């Protein structure tokens, strides 16, 4: 049976655009019903890497389970959670993606972070995250203290280092910075490692699924 996304795009649904919350829960589906120009997608602008592939891999799913891979209340004792954005407003108030967590400095430091997850389930786990690129060096230091940060994401079948590039993009939804979104499928028995000293839009909810 088709997956009805209403006014949301796959990106808005899978990242957890706050306006995509009322979507009814589904454990299986075949074919995703998406409008030609969905109103609610990447509310904070950025590049969604490998997006068409992700759309194809999620077109038919037999089992789908969202779980809190990095629980908000216990995973980030050394960092704060940003106030989100007006670009991702819900009910006239600034908010952010439900499935991601915008980490910011705690006090005068953004401490180095290392967070890992072992796929204890017997299904593949879809993990999503982002990398923030501020428009100015003032916003970079205001949020993350250090001027030159890195993000590192490594599994047994994934390894990538991300470097924020500070510059004004054309304004999109009143935002000249960007958050680039990435994902990988974590096979059972594999471990994913997140390392960063700034600019990490951390996973909060991941998805254990069986494709096809």
């Amino acid at each position: 049976a088709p997956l009805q996304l209403g006014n949301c795009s796959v990106a808005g649904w899978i990242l957890g655009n706050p306006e995509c919350e009322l979507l009814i829960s589904r454990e299986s589906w075949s074919y995703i019903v998406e409008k030609p120009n969905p109103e609610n997608g990447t509310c904070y602008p950025g590049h969604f890497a490998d997006y068409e592939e992700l759309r194809e891999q999620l077109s038919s799913v037999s089992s789908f389970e969202r779980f809190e891979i990095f629980p908000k209340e216990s995973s980030w004792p050394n960092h704060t959670q940003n106030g989100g954005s007006n670009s991702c407003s819900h009910n006239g108030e600034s908010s952010f993606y439900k499935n991601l967590l915008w980490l910011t400095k705690s006090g005068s430091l953004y401490p180095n972070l290392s967070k890992s997850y072992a796929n204890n389930k017997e299904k593949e786990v879809l993990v999503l995250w982002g990398v923030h690129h501020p428009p100015t060096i003032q916003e970079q230091t205001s949020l993350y203290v250090k001027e030159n940060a890195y993000v590192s994401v490594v599994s047994s079948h994934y390894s990538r280092k991300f470097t924020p590039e500070i510059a004004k993009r054309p304004k999109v939804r009143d935002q000249e910075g960007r958050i680039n979104y990435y994902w990988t499928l974590l096979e059972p028995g594999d471990t994913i490692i997140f390392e960063a000293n700034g600019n990490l839009i951390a996973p909060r909810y991941a998805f254990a699924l069986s494709r096809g």
Partner: antibody
Amino acid sequence: QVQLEESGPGLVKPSETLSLTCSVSGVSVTSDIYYWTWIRQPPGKGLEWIGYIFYNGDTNYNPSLKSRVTMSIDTSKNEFSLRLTSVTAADTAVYFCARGTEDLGYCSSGSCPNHWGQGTLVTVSS
Amino acid sequence: GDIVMTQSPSSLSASIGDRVTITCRPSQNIRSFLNWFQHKPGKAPKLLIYAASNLQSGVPSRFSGSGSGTEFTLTIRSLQPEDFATYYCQQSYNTPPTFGQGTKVEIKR
């Protein structure tokens, strides 16, 4: 913030090579996120995109001009240039240099120049 | 230059305070990869609208962009004398980038 200034207007002899330079102030031409572009407007016609160049080595020139076009970046002067060989009167135009910011969610690579110079007029004449 | 960008009209005249709409139609679907430029005599062309509908910093809110696919609209509400210019759409979907032929907006007074 960023300022772009094309080289002075003037003449090129037919079949010779047009050389223009764009002076950049406010950012480095070596930055990985910025691309540098040339556009031209012949008299009484519209805009024609010529191409872009990244410092990292990525370039793309309009197939209508690809064989005649060479762009380069001068990090010592913080400038970038356009060379156009074998010019004819069809190449008489105002030439604009411009900067864009790589933004793959909303633009093809190197395809959205959002800070332009005011342009310089090149006349092909003997 | 394979994606042809066709603007309509090629020139128009309107009074101060009028609502002005300019249409741009690509020869194929370009999703939202569509920008609008303003070009005043002797001045650098200016990006007003980015990716079909995003107003750029410092541009008066009387300018707006809408559309997707094969139909796009630039709207100037409450036309002002300083809005005399030629307006171009530009597609960023395929290389090479291509511009519309331009729309000259004149002021009726």
